[PDB]
Amino acid sequence: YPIINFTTAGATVQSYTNFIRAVRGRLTTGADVRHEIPVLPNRVGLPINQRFILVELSNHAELSVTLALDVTNAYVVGYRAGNSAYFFHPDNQEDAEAITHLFTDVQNRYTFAFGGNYDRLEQLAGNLRENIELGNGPLEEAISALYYYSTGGTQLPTLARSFIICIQMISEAARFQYIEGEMRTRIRYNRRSAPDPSVITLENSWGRLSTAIQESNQGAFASPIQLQRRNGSKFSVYDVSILIPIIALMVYRCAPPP
Amino acid sequence: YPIINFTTAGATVQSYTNFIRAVRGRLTTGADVRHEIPVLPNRVGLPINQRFILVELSNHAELSVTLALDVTNAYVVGYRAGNSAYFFHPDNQEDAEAITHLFTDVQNRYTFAFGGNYDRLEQLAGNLRENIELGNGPLEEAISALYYYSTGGTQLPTLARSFIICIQMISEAARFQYIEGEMRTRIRYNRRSAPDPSVITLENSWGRLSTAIQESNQGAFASPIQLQRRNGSKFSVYDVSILIPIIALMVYRCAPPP
Question: What happens on changing residue 69 to A/M (chains A, B)?
Answer without folding.
Answer: No effect on the toxic activity or the vascular leak syndrome
